[PDB]
Enzyme design. Structure first.
Site, PDB file in Angstrom:
ATOM      1  N   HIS A 238       8.708   1.991  -5.353  1.00 20.61           N
ATOM      2  CA  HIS A 238       9.918   2.775  -5.116  1.00 20.61           C
ATOM      3  C   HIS A 238       9.843   3.471  -3.753  1.00 20.61           C
ATOM      4  O   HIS A 238       8.770   3.876  -3.309  1.00 20.61           O
ATOM      5  CB  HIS A 238      10.099   3.829  -6.228  1.00 20.61           C
TER       6      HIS A 238
ATOM      7  N   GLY B 121       9.049  15.186   4.124  1.00 15.10           N
ATOM      8  CA  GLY B 121       7.882  15.306   5.000  1.00 15.10           C
ATOM      9  C   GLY B 121       6.688  14.554   4.421  1.00 15.10           C
ATOM     10  O   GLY B 121       6.818  13.819   3.442  1.00 15.10           O
TER      11      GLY B 121
ATOM     12  N   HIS C 242      -4.840  -2.691   7.641  1.00 15.20           N
ATOM     13  CA  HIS C 242      -4.337  -2.008   8.833  1.00 15.20           C
ATOM     14  C   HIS C 242      -5.215  -2.345  10.036  1.00 15.20           C
ATOM     15  O   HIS C 242      -6.410  -2.605   9.891  1.00 15.20           O
ATOM     16  CB  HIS C 242      -4.345  -0.491   8.607  1.00 15.20           C
TER      17      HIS C 242
ATOM     18  N   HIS D  53       2.103  -4.431   3.640  1.00 14.80           N
ATOM     19  CA  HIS D  53       1.167  -4.183   2.551  1.00 14.80           C
ATOM     20  C   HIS D  53       1.344  -5.222   1.450  1.00 14.80           C
ATOM     21  O   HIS D  53       0.380  -5.607   0.786  1.00 14.80           O
ATOM     22  CB  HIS D  53       1.393  -2.780   1.980  1.00 14.80           C
TER      23      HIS D  53
ATOM     24  N   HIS E 112       7.418  -2.951   7.889  1.00 20.61           N
ATOM     25  CA  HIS E 112       6.142  -2.268   7.710  1.00 20.61           C
ATOM     26  C   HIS E 112       5.712  -2.298   6.247  1.00 20.61           C
ATOM     27  O   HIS E 112       4.577  -2.658   5.934  1.00 20.61           O
ATOM     28  CB  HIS E 112       6.233  -0.817   8.188  1.00 20.61           C
ATOM     29  N   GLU E 113       6.618  -1.913   5.356  1.00 18.09           N
ATOM     30  CA  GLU E 113       6.307  -1.899   3.930  1.00 18.09           C
ATOM     31  C   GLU E 113       5.836  -3.276   3.470  1.00 18.09           C
ATOM     32  O   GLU E 113       4.824  -3.396   2.782  1.00 18.09           O
ATOM     33  CB  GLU E 113       7.538  -1.476   3.128  1.00 18.09           C
TER      34      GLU E 113
HETATM   35  C1  LIG Z   1       2.088   4.665   2.380  1.00 16.81           C
HETATM   36  C2  LIG Z   1       1.301   5.292   3.548  1.00 16.81           C
HETATM   37  C3  LIG Z   1      -0.128   5.611   3.096  1.00 16.81           C
HETATM   38  C4  LIG Z   1       1.341   4.395   4.803  1.00 16.81           C
HETATM   39  N1  LIG Z   1       2.692   4.322   5.345  1.00 16.81           N
HETATM   40  S1  LIG Z   1       3.339   5.710   6.170  1.00 16.81           S
HETATM   41  O1  LIG Z   1       2.204   6.386   6.726  1.00 16.81           O
HETATM   42  O2  LIG Z   1       4.153   6.371   5.195  1.00 16.81           O
HETATM   43  C5  LIG Z   1       4.355   5.105   7.485  1.00 16.81           C
HETATM   44  C6  LIG Z   1       3.828   4.183   8.421  1.00 16.81           C
HETATM   45  C7  LIG Z   1       4.690   3.541   9.346  1.00 16.81           C
HETATM   46  C8  LIG Z   1       6.040   3.928   9.417  1.00 16.81           C
HETATM   47  C9  LIG Z   1       6.513   4.943   8.583  1.00 16.81           C
HETATM   48  C10 LIG Z   1       5.696   5.538   7.596  1.00 16.81           C
HETATM   49  S2  LIG Z   1       8.203   5.350   8.935  1.00 16.81           S
HETATM   50  C11 LIG Z   1       8.313   4.065  10.154  1.00 16.81           C
HETATM   51  C12 LIG Z   1       9.456   3.729  10.914  1.00 16.81           C
HETATM   52  C13 LIG Z   1       9.365   2.667  11.844  1.00 16.81           C
HETATM   53  C14 LIG Z   1       8.181   1.890  11.897  1.00 16.81           C
HETATM   54  C15 LIG Z   1       7.017   2.312  11.205  1.00 16.81           C
HETATM   55  C16 LIG Z   1       7.105   3.383  10.299  1.00 16.81           C
HETATM   56  C17 LIG Z   1       0.811   2.979   4.494  1.00 16.81           C
HETATM   57  O3  LIG Z   1       0.993   2.136   5.538  1.00 16.81           O
HETATM   58  O4  LIG Z   1       0.301   2.664   3.462  1.00 16.81           O
HETATM   59 ZN   LIG Z   2       8.104   5.044  -6.718  1.00 16.36          ZN
HETATM   60 ZN   LIG Z   3       0.867   0.086   6.709  1.00 15.99          ZN
END
Ligand SMILES: CC(C)[C@H](NS(=O)(=O)c1ccc2c(c1)sc1ccccc12)C(=O)O
Ligand SMILES: [Zn+2]
Ligand SMILES: [Zn+2]
Length: 165
Positions: A98, A80, A130, A124, A120-121
């Protein structure tokens, strides 16, 4: 007090290398690499860059999956809240981020898609701030779909284009 910005491999904000020195015993490890290879492509498709993974050595950014905890970070809170994390990519033991596996993953999607999340990852990674709400892959499950059905929107394209290609 943070001007430092070194880089071992081909680091020049243009080409970013990714290495997976580990996965997770629960699903096809190849499905973790393949989708990562098809993910880094989504960016090259709309960028004249070149992201490649070295078989061995040091890469611009190191990717590692785990559950519960893994020394680094104050340890995940559990299932969660957050789904992933990313530290300032550019420092020695900083880019070696990680992923949080504490959750239930499935290559078939359903739960938390790692593919959609992949793009998405990386967002950054390219120091991409954003936006407001341009139906970007950032939005929660903007377009929940398979990996081969993955498709960007004209709005998500209006964000990156900010580089002019
Ligand atoms: C690390 C956190 C502060 C944040 N990411 S998040 O809120 O965990 C975050 C944002 C976008 C998405 C997820 C989790 S899971 C998922 C699946 C499909 C497409 C988009 C996403 C961020 O963008 O930095
Ligand atoms: Zn980590
Ligand atoms: Zn983001």
């Amino acid at each position: 007090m943070f001007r430092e910005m070194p880089g071992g491999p081909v680091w020049r904000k243009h080409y970013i290398t990714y290495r997976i020195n580990n996965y997770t015993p629960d699903m096809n490890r190849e499905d973790v690499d393949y989708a990562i290879r098809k993910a880094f492509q989504v960016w090259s498709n709309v960028t004249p860059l070149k992201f490649s993974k070295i078989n061995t050595g040091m890469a611009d950014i190191l990717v590692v999956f785990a559950r519960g905890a893994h020394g680094d970070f104050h340890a995940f809170d559990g299932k969660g809240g957050i789904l992933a994390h990313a530290f300032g990519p550019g420092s020695g033991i900083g880019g070696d981020a990680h992923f949080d596996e504490d959750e239930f993953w499935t290559t078939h999607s359903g739960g938390t898609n790692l593919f959609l999340t992949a793009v998405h990852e990386i967002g950054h990674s390219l120091g991409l701030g954003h936006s407001s709400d341009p139906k970007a892959v950032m939005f929660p499950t903007y377009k929940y779909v398979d990996i081969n059905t993955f498709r960007l929107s004209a709005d998500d394209i209006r964000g990156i284009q900010s580089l002019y290609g």
